[PDB]
Design a protein around this nucleic acid. Structure first.
Ligand SMILES: OC[C@H]1O[C@@](CO)(O[C@H]2O[C@H](CO)[C@@H](O)[C@H](O)[C@H]2O)[C@@H](O)[C@@H]1O
Ligand SMILES: OC[C@H]1O[C@@](CO)(O[C@H]2O[C@H](CO)[C@@H](O)[C@H](O)[C@H]2O)[C@@H](O)[C@@H]1O
Ligand SMILES: [Mg+2]
Length: 580
DNA sequence: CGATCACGCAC
DNA sequence: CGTACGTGATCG
């Protein structure tokens, strides 16, 4: 059953053909400055394994890697490209990435190794990575014969599966989505991750100290008000204090005990002074554990940068996610947590942080896809969309919209985008199902095009088996035909929400590609650092701000043409916090 | 010692 | 009511 290959001791010309499947193996999950443990090449001339110390010191091999006219097919080329950037080696000419291809064909399969992708086309002559390397404490690179066979089998699978994957993408009208959107984006994400974001660790450490002080003060107040010391971070020890010793009302349960989620606590606050303190303690503790201690844990001590990894092949809607650290969930709503962003600073002297965000991109996308006359007109007038929604559903003039009315209309707008449900809206606004249902009815009366869209997209999902986004991303929804109400209803909300969230993802991905091309044409030093779903964060010399103020919003606004304008706001400053 | 829960942070 | 990730506590 074994697969034949040459275990090479040196690089030869036949390993440098102008088309090959290439494996540059990095086993560490976080590939930043990580070891390359082996290399495999499969091409018209045969199958080869190379030790990295050999290949990466070979000028002909390094030149071949960097030659855009020598085409490579890979799985997770970003991992290889970043590991190689840390070694000062450029990887070019990647014309097919099997991870991205599998992800576009069906994000729900959770493909995260070559074996998983291969199994989609009944190809099973390759082992799962976890079977070869193990996981956790037991993880390890195996001896060379085992490692080499595995890497060659992966390269061989890629070599075989490129054509059938590309053919299916073409049938789905997704080939341009792979080749013109996701693959070029992967190179841009590699650059962003490698550049990293500079952290002011002294500032973080100062914050940590002050937080520790306040945590102590609140911890003691809590013990004083409880008349006893306990582990506040145990939802179970806390449940006893709250609902037994102090007799607070049980407004909600969890399947293992009493709920102490913030929504429940907020309702209990009027009964006892301890509750406000538990909330404050939780807020501070979140900042301390996750955003100070957690961040400091992953800052590289030499450069004081953090280098996130953007998972490009995970979310079911086409968004990116971010890990180690997650730079897509840094606090902003509450001023206390917002100050964390003061610690993210430009990487060079006299540079600044520039941040540009789409204004209401999801509702603008909804206006476009639903062709709702009222919603399109609202955005053509650049109205405050929550005030407008309040005017319509509560039937009042702009003057007559109160803050509470705008607040409830805002929640309705979220619900509509998420996949509206009377129960979920009711939970969010703390009102009755019947009341939430009345709001939803008034909304559909004011935006009948949106109502028609929500009905039609659920029927389309049922008919075709999937829904699609602007640039032809797809999500299969098998549960749409379930005879279980709750299962089916969740699938219906995904049918409604995915073309909205996913088309917004497509637009900002295209914007990133267009922006990098413009930055290069203009030879600006400015470069992307982060994407947070509907916003792009850059750093640049202070002397480039004026040019960026014009260039970045324009590129983002013009990335696609919709039936309504796109609008981008922007800010810049000496830290991420100040880019407001 | 990995897997799970409950919770809270972003958009 | 949609999409994510990290944490401390607990589970087994
Ligand atoms: O390299 C990213 C790419 O690798 C995958 C596995 O194929 O995820 C791995 O890499 C991560 C980043 O360090 C981890 O978060 C993840 O646990 C790990 O399996 C893909 O999911 C991802 O696109
Ligand atoms: O009465 C129609 C109304 O119900 C929805 C669910 O909110 O869909 C239901 O009715 C459809 C048939 O008309 C079914 O295909 C569907 O499976 C069922 O849940 C809405 O789509 C809708 O317009
Ligand atoms: Mg915004």
């Amino acid at each position: 059953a074994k697969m034949a290959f040459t275990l090479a001791d040196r690089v030869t010309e036949e390993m440098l053909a102008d088309k090959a499947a290439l494996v540059v193996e990095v086993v560490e999950e976080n590939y930043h400055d990580a070891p390359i443990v082996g290399i495999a090449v499969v091409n018209e001339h045969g199958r080869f394994f190379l030790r990295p110390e050999t290949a990466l010191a070979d000028p002909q091999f390094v030149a071949w890697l960097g030659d855009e006219t020598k085409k490579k097919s890979m799985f997770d080329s970003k991992r290889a490209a970043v590991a190689l950037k840390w070694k000062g080696i450029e990887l070019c000419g990647v014309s097919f990435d099997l991870l991205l291809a599998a992800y576009l064909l069906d994000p729900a399969q959770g493909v995260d190794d070559v074996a998983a992708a291969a199994k989609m086309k009944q190809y099973e002559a390759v082992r799962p990575d976890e079977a070869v390397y193990g996981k956790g404490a037991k993880r390890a690179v195996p001896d060379e014969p085992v490692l080499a066979e595995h890497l060659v089998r992966k390269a061989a699978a890629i070599w075989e599966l490129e054509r059938p994957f590309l053919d299916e993408l073409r049938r789905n009208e997704q080939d341009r989505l792979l080749v013109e959107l996701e693959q070029p984006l992967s190179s841009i994400l590699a650059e962003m991750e490698f550049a990293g974001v500079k952290v002011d660790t002294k500032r973080l450490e100062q914050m940590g100290k002050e937080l520790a002080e306040q945590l102590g003060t609140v911890e003691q107040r809590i013990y004083e008000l409880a008349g006893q010391e306990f582990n506040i971070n145990s939802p179970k020890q806390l449940g006893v204090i709250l609902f037994e010793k102090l007799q607070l009302p049980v407004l909600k349960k969890t399947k293992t005990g009493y709920s102490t989620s913030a929504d429940v606590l907020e309702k209990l606050a009027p009964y006892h002074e301890i509750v406000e303190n538990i909330l404050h303690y939780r807020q501070l503790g979140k900042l301390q554990s996750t955003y100070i201690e957690g961040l400091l844990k992953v800052v590289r001590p030499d450069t004081k940068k953090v280098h996130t990894i953007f998972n490009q092949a995970l979310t079911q809607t086409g968004r990116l996610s971010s890990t180690e650290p997650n730079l897509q969930n840094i606090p902003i709503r509450l001023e206390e947590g917002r100050k964390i962003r003061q610690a993210f600073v430009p990487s060079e002297s006299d540079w600044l942080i520039f941040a540009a965000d789409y204004s209401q991109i999801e509702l603008r996308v909804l206006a476009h896809i639903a062709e709702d006359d009222n919603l399109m007109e609202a955005f053509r007038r650049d109205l405050d969309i929550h005030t407008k929604t309040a005017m319509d559903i509560f039937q009042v003039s702009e003057d007559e919209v109160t803050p509470n009315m705008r607040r409830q209309a805002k929640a309705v707008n979220f619900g509509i985008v998420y996949g509206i449900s009377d129960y979920g809206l009711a939970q969010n606004l703390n009102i009755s199902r019947k009341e939430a249902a009345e709001f939803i009815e008034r909304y559909f009366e004011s935006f009948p095009g949106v109502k028609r869209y929500m009905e039609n997209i659920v029927q389309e999902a049922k008919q075709k088996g999937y829904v699609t986004t602007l640039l032809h991303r797809r999500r299969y929804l098998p549960d749409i035909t379930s005879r279980n109400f709750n299962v089916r209803s969740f699938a219906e909300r995904m049918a409604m929400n995915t073309p909205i969230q996913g088309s917004a993802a497509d637009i900002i991905k295209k914007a990133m590609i267009d922006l990098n091309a413009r930055l290069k044409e203009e030879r600006l030093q400015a470069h992307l650092l982060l994407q947070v779903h509907d916003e792009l964060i850059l750093e640049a010399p202070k002397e480039e701000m004026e040019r960026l103020c014009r260039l970045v919003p324009e590129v983002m606004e013009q990335a696609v043409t919709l039936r309504v304008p796109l609008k981008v706001d922007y800010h810049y400053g000496s830290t991420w916090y100040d880019a407001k």
